[PDB]
Subunit: 270 residues, 2 copies
């Protein structure tokens, strides 16, 4: 049994597809295989917001479900539908995909084509949350608007900023991939440090976009090391100051606000 | 002189804080006192791995260093820094804590606040092992990854599973939120009552909730409602799929061989 799709973000709609693949595999006493298409066609079209996560990160998540193989979009898009099936689906009796699934030359391949070739296909309906269909597009839009508190309902977890590291803040290099950017401003984040230690931080998003985080209650150099930041809440909009002391006041004020929010989170469990 | 912290696991970094406290006490000609906060703030967050040991077990270990008093997270979380000092640090002239120590509502209290109140604060630097700073978080992650062989370098001893109760002994660790080992099979040293020590093969599996079952080698009068302490020595193999009775004999075989090697290493 095979699942096919981009799966950018591995949101709850994606998880539904993957779980379905696993159930069928179990039912059929068969093995599972995930084909993840590198990029959606929009990635190569005007005004693309960007991926929610790198392909590498996506594959790490998909791999927890089943063996995962990346299909290079730029390549498979030139294959005839027959060519695609001949190269990737021999012996496969069941395919699980989402709605509007397309593949091959001029996107001429679809679920109907796969069925006519002996392959049975389950097209999973999108998950609906608050009257909206869960999609990578919708989540990217939420990121661009800074509505990070609303993301978990669709993504299944908090939106994350991840990269190499490049008051004493830390700049995050997210890599060369085309990724979606947060709305400029100040955010409260949960910092996942290398040791495995977790801290809270104040992250500034400014401008390409630059990601800087001030980690609360932590001291040390993290240069050359990876950091994973869960973006929890939008604190305030970007603000320009015509003075350094005014900036200082602003920072010290953000950290105080952060500590208060953290306290609220802690006391919310009771 | 008072040490303050959570001290979950009493690892080598904690031991450094406590040893320093005792030295300061000696030269100041003071008594020593350890305030151990029941739970860290993270304990209440959904992704908390769990404590390395119960508060009771922790207190028993801390008591080997000095008189130990538990601070109830619930009773101190809403106090102002001023309120905390008034209620817990009356007459205290010195405290020993880790760097970045925080207390009071909104974590507004810190070392600087204490100094302004006339209290001398000795901040203790994190201990570094390999290229990593020792912390309960680091050790908790090793446990989750089943990397039990690497734990002693940070904890100062093997990670332990403690509780009441092929055949096997099912260990009830209590009602506290404790960290769970990576599912699978482990080699453990079993500390039975009466100072007896045996080896065992422990299985960690589900039902959500994690169960701990140990096949104790060379011992038959199973300790029904008795207390057991297991040192987790080695990760043997991952969890697997009626040849269960086959997989077992293979595990025991591996255990016997590992045990023999230890002995041969006089």
């Amino acid at each position: 049994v095979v699942s096919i799709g981009v799966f950018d973000g591995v949101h709850i709609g994606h998880q539904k597809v993957l779980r379905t693949m696993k159930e069928i595999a179990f039912f059929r006493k068969d093995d599972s295989l995930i084909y993840t298409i590198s990029y959606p066609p929009e990635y190569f079209l005007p005004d693309f917001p960007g991926l929610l996560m790198t392909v590498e990160s996506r594959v790490e998540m998909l791999s927890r479900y089943a063996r995962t193989v990346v299909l290079d979009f730029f390549r498979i898009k030139d294959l005839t539908p027959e060519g695609f099936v001949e190269r990737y689906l021999s012996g496969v009796s069941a395919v699980v995909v989402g709605r509007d699934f397309r593949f091959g030359k001029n996107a001429s391949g679809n679920a109907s084509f796969l069925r006519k070739k002996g392959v049975e296909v389950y097209e999973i309906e999108d998950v609906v949350v608050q009257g909206k269909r869960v999609s990578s597009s919708l989540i990217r839009n939420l990121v661009q608007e800074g509505r990070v508190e609303e993301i978990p309902a669709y993504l299944g977890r908090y939106f994350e900023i991840e990269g190499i590291v490049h008051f004493p803040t830390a700049n995050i290099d997210r890599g060369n991939e085309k990724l979606v950017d947060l709305k400029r401003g100040v955010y409260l984040v949960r910092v996942h440090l290398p040791d495995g230690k977790k801290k809270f931080g104040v992250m500034n998003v400014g401008f390409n976009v630059k990601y800087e985080v001030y980690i609360l209650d932590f001291e040390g150099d993290l240069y050359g090391q990876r950091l994973k930041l869960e973006v929890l809440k939008f604190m305030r909009d970007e603000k320009k100051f015509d003075s350094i002391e005014e900036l200082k006041a602003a920072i010290d004020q953000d950290v105080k606000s952060a500590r208060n929010m953290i306290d609220d989170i802690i006391n919310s469990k009771f």
